[PDB]
C-alpha cells in the first residue's frame, strides 16, 4: 500500500510516486471482488514530460515492476519511421501481437503488457512553425472497434505542446505529470546512492562530506551527478598511478587507491559543465581587460544594477523586469552588462548574441531565441542577456531594411510571464535609441540607463594613471595639452590608440599619441 | 477557470466611475445577444491608451456572462508561426465556437496579430 520506491534507485522522486499511485492505479490495488462488483474500467495510459536526463525511464521501469507485469517492449520515436509507403504502420502494428494472442487464448485472465514509447513527439502532426496516417493508426489500435483490456502505454516527451490533441482525450492517455529538476535533499540522496558501493570497501569517506558536495551543485540534473562521481574516480586513479610510478613507495600505499576530496573539488571545477546552470568560462571572453573605475558614472551604473537585482529577487506583484543600456559606440556597454549579471549570484545565467548565428536565416534565429527562453523558464531564478539588438534585427540605414519576424518574436517575448512562482530578469544593450523608439520597442522596456563617454581632461589623466602606460614627464605634457577640456573619446578607442602609439621608438611616442588623439576631435 | 485567473492577476479595483460605465455597457451587450432573433451576431471593440488595462476588463466581462463556451485567442501562443498557421488556428477556434448553442470569443491584441510596424508600413494582408 505504501510502496517501496526509496529502496531501489529513484532516489529523489518520492512525492511524484505517491501522487501517481494515488491518482490513477486505484483499481489495481483493491480486492478484485468489489472492483468487479462495481464494474469500473482501468486507465489505459499515462504521460511524463520534463527536462532531459532527470530520471523518467527509471520511473517507468519501477512502475512496470510494481504491477508484476511482463517484460516491457521499449521503443524509440525516430526508429519508427521509414521512407517507403505503408512501412511505419507495420512497425506500429507489430507491437500488439502478443497482447492480441493472449487476449484471445486466455480470455479475460491474461496479465499486463506494458509498452514504453520514447520521444513520442516525433510521430505527430502539430509541427506548425509527418505522415498523419501514423497517429491515426496508433489511435485506431489503442482504442477501436475491437477492445484490448490487458495493456498499458507509457509515453515520454521533452516538448509537451507539440502533441496531437486527439491523443489526450479521456479513454486514451489521460494522466499527465512533470518530473522537474531536483533540489538539495534530492541531490544528497542521488549522490549517496551512487557512492554507496565505493564506501562499502571503505575506500571513500576520507574527509569528504556529501552535504558539502551537495550545496556546491546548484542546478545539476540527475545524470550529471553520476558523471561527476565517475570523473572524480578516474582522475584520482590516474593521479595515484602517476605518483606511485614516480616514487618507489612501499606496497602499503601501492595498494591504497583512495579517492580524495581534492579530486571531487577539482573535477567539479574543471570537468563537469552543467547544461541548465551557470558557466564561468564565457565571462572572461567579454570582460577581458576588466573594469577600471575612471569616474562616477561607472559607480552609478553598477549601483543601479544592484538595485534592480534586489528589486527582482524578493518581491511580488511584479515577477518580470527589463532594462536597456544605451550609449554612443565604443563606450563598453557589454562589459558592464556582463558584470551586472555576474554580481547577482543567480543560478542560471545565459548570454545570447549574434556571434553564434553567422549565416542563419530569420527562422533559425527565432528558433534559437525561443529555445534559450524555454531553457530559462525551467528554473526558480534566471538572467538573460541580449548583446546587440540592432544586429539581431539586421538593420541598415539605407532602405531601411530589416527582418520583421524576429522583431515580432522579441516584442511578444518581452511581455510573457513565466510559469507560476518563478522570476526572470532581462538586460538588453544597443547603440541606436532613436530607431528603437520609432519602432515602438522602447515602450516595452521597463527602464533605461545611459552610458556616457570621457569628456574632461582629468578623467583621461586618471584613466591613463590607472592603466599605467605612460610616465610622469610625458603625463605633464599630456595634461598641459588636454587641459582644453575638448575631448570626446571611447574607452575601447582609447585602448586602441594607446596600443597603436606604443609601437614606435621611445622618442616620438608622446607626439604620435597626441596627434592621433587630436585627429579624433569629435563634437556631439 | 484558469485563463481568467491567469489574465486577471491582481483583481479589479474601483478607482473611479469609468469602470462602472464599461462594465454596464458590457452587461447590456451580453443581454442583447442573449435575447433576440434578428441580431444573431454581435461585435464590440475596446480601445484606449497603452498600459490602460484593456485585457483585464474584457476577460472580466467574458467571465461574468455565464455562457457555456468561452475561449481567448491571444497572440503569445503563436510565437514563430507563419501566416498560414495563424489563419488555420483562428479558423479552428471559430469553427469550434460554431458547434455550441451559446458562445463568446475574445480576440486580444489585434495589432500584434497583423504584425504592424509604423516604418513602411508592413503587415500580413
Ligand atoms: N570601466 C569600464 N567599463 C567598461 N569596459 C571597460 C572598463 N574598463 C575597461 N574596460 C574594457 O573595455 C572593454 C569594453 O568594450 P566593449 O567590447 O564592451 O565595447 P562595446 O560597447 O561592446 O562596443 P560595440 O558597442 O561597438 O560593440 C573591455 O575590454 C573592458 O575590459
Ligand atoms: N480597474 C482595473 N482595470 C483593469 N486592470 C486593473 C484594474 N485594477 C487592477 N488592474 C490590474 O491591471 C492589470 C491590467 O493590465 P493589462 O495587462 O490588461 O494592460 P494592457 O492594456 O493589456 O497593456 P497592453 O495593452 O500594453 O498589453 C492587471 O494586473 C489587473 O489585475
Ligand atoms: N532520481 C535519480 N536517482 C538516481 N539516478 C538517477 C535519477 N534520475 C536520473 N538518474 C540517472 O540518470 C540516468 C537515467 O536517465 P533517464 O531515466 O534515461 O532519463 P531520460 O530518459 O530523460 O534521459 C541513469 O544514469 C541514472 O542513474
Ligand atoms: Mg555591443
Ligand atoms: Mg493587451
B112 touches chain A (CB under 8 A): yes
Q: How far apart are CA A217 and CA A386, in angstroms?
A: 27
Task: Choose among B10, B79, B118: nearest Cβ to A412.
Answer: B79
Residue A252 parent element (H or E): helix A251-255
In angstroms and rounded to an integer, the radius of gyration of the C-alpha atoms of chain B is 16
Pick the closest to residue A280 from A349, A219, A369 (CA basis).
A349
Residue among A54, A155, A185, A196 to mutate when testing ligand 3 (max atoms within 8 A of CB): A54
In angstroms and rounded to an integer, the radius of gyration of the C-alpha atoms of chain A is 31
Sign of CA dihedral A103, A105, A111, A115: negative
Pick the closest to residue A380 from A209, A146, A183, A160 (CA basis).
A183
Q: Do A154 and A117 meet the contact criterion of CB atoms below 8 Å apart?
A: yes
Sheet order of strands, A151-157 included: A45-49, A151-157, A113-116, A73-74
Burial class (CB in 10 A: 0-12, 13-18, 19+), A9: middle
Q: Which residues of B65-97 are buried (b: 16+ CB within 10 A; e: fewer)?
A: beeeebbbbbbeebbbbeeeebeeeeeeeeeee
Question: What's the CA-to-centroid distance between B55 and ligand 2, angstroms?
Answer: 6
Burial class (CB in 10 A: 0-12, 13-18, 19+), A440: middle
Task: Choose among B80, B112, B115: nearest Cβ to A129.
Answer: B80
Grid cell of A10 as nine digits: 529513484
Q: How far apart are CA A197 and CA A202, in angstroms?
A: 9
Q: How far apart are CA A155 and CA A160, in angstroms?
A: 11
Grid cell of A401 as nine digits: 531594411
Resolution (A): 3.5
CA distances from residue B5 to B2, B8, B11, B60, B61 in whole angstroms, order as listed = 5, 5, 9, 10, 13
Q: How far apart are CA A368 and CA A370, in angstroms?
A: 5
DSSP helix/strand/coil, A111: coil
Method used to obtain the model: cryo-EM
Percent of chain A that is helix, strand, coil (3-state, to 5): 45, 10, 45
Quick count: other Cβ atoms within 10 Å of Cβ A213? 21
DSSP A184-244: HHHHHHHHHHHHTTGGGGT-S-SS--HHHHHHH-SS--HHHHHHHHHHHHHHHHHHHHHHH
SS3 sequence, A487-511? CCECHHHHHHHHHHHCCCCCCCHHH
Interface size A-B, in CB pairs within 8 Å, comes to 43
Burial class (CB in 10 A: 0-12, 13-18, 19+), A284: exposed
**Residue whose grid cell is 515492476:** A65
Sign of CA dihedral A414, A419, A420, A425: negative
B93 touches chain A (CB under 8 A): no
Burial class (CB in 10 A: 0-12, 13-18, 19+), A136: middle
DSSP conformational letter for A51:
S
To 10 degrees, what angle do helices A509-519 and A491-501 make?
A: 150
State the best of A365, A408, A416, A437 to mutate against chain B, taking most chain B CBs within 10 Å. Answer: A408
Pick the closest to residue A445 from A423, A419, A418, A415 (CA basis).
A415
Q: What is the largest CA-CA distance in chain A?
A: 105
Question: Judged by CB atoms within 8 Å, which residues 338-397 of A form the interface with B?
Answer: 363, 366-367, 370
Per DSSP bridges, beta strands A73-74 and A382-386 are unpaired
Q: How far apart are CA A151 and CA A98, in angstroms?
A: 11
Amino acid at each position: 500500500p505504501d510502496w517501496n520506491f526509496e529502496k531501489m534507485g529513484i532516489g529523489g522522486l518520492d512525492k511524484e510516486f505517491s501522487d501517481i499511485f494515488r491518482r490513477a492505479f486505484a483499481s489495481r490495488v483493491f480486492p478484485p471482488e468489489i472492483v468487479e462488483q462495481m464494474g469500473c474500467k482501468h486507465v489505459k495510459g499515462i504521460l511524463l514530460y520534463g527536462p532531459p536526463g532527470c530520471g523518467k525511464t527509471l520511473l517507468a521501469r519501477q512502475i512496470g515492476k510494481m504491477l508484476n507485469a511482463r517484460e516491457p517492449k521499449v521503443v524509440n520515436g525516430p526508429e519508427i519511421l521509414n521512407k517507403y509507403v505503408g512501412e511505419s504502420e507495420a512497425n506500429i502494428r507489430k507491437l500488439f501481437a502478443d497482447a492480441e494472442e493472449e487476449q484471445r487464448r486466455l480470455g479475460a485472465n491474461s496479465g499486463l503488457h506494458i509498452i514504453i514509447f520514447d520521444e513520442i513527439d516525433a510521430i505527430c502532426k502539430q509541427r506548425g512553425s509527418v505522415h498523419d496516417t501514423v497517429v491515426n493508426q496508433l489511435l485506431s489500435k489503442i482504442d477501436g472497434v475491437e477492445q484490448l483490456n490487458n495493456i498499458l502505454v507509457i509515453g515520454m516527451t521533452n516538448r509537451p505542446d507539440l502533441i496531437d490533441e486527439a491523443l489526450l482525450r479521456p479513454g486514451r492517455l489521460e494522466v499527465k505529470m512533470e518530473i522537474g529538476l531536483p533540489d538539495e535533499k534530492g541531490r544528497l540522496q542521488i549522490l549517496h546512492i551512487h557512492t554507496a558501493r565505493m564506501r562499502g570497501h571503505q575506500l571513500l569517506s576520507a574527509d569528504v562530506d556529501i552535504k558539502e558536495l551537495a550545496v556546491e551543485t546548484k542546478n545539476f540534473s540527475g545524470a550529471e551527478l553520476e558523471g561527476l562521481v565517475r570523473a572524480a574516480q578516474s582522475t584520482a586513479m590516474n593521479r595515484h598511478i602517476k605518483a606511485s610510478t614516480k616514487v618507489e613507495v612501499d606496497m602499503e600505499k601501492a595498494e591504497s587507491l583512495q579517492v580524495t576530496r581534492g579530486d571531487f573539488l577539482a573535477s567539479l571545477e574543471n570537468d563537469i559543465k552543467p547544461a541548465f546552470g551557470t558557466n564561468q568560462e564565457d565571462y572572461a571572453s567579454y570582460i577581458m581587460n576588466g573594469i577600471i573605475k575612471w569616474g562616477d558614472p561607472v559607480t552609478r551604473v553598477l549601483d543601479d544594477g544592484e538595485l534592480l537585482v534586489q528589486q527582482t529577487k524578493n518581491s511580488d506583484r511584479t515577477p518580470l523586469v527589463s532594462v536597456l543600456l544605451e550609449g554612443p559606440p565604443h563606450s563598453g556597454k557589454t562589459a558592464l552588462a556582463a558584470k551586472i549579471a555576474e554580481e547577482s549570484n543567480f543560478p542560471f545565467i545565459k548570454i545570447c548574441s549574434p556571434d553564434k548565428m553567422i549565416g542563419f536565416s530569420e527562422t533559425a534565429k527565432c528558433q534559437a531565441m525561443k529555445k534559450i527562453f524555454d531553457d530559462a523558464y525551467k528554473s526558480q531564478l534566471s538572467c538573460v542577456v541580449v548583446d546587440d539588438i540592432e544586429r539581431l534585427l539586421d538593420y541598415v540605414p539605407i532602405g531601411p531594411r530589416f527582418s520583421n519576424l524576429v522583431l515580432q518574436a522579441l516584442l511578444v517575448l518581452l511581455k510573457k510571464a513565466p510559469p507560476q512562482g518563478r522570476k526572470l530578469l532581462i538586460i538588453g544593450t544597443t547603440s541606436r535609441k532613436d530607431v528603437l523608439q520609432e519602432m515602438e520597442m522602447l515602450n516595452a522596456f521597463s527602464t533605461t540607463i545611459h552610458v556616457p563617454n570621457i569628456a574632461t581632461g582629468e578623467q583621461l589623466l586618471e584613466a591613463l594613471e590607472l592603466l599605467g602606460n605612460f610616465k610622469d614627464k610625458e603625463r605633464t605634457t599630456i595634461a598641459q595639452q588636454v587641459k582644453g577640456k575638448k575631448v570626446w573619446i571611447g574607452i575601447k578607442k582609447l585602448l586602441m590608440l594607446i596600443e597603436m602609439s606604443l609601437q614606435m621608438d621611445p622618442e616620438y611616442r608622446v607626439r604620435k599619441f597626441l596627434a592621433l588623439l587630436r585627429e579624433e576631435g569629435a563634437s556631439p
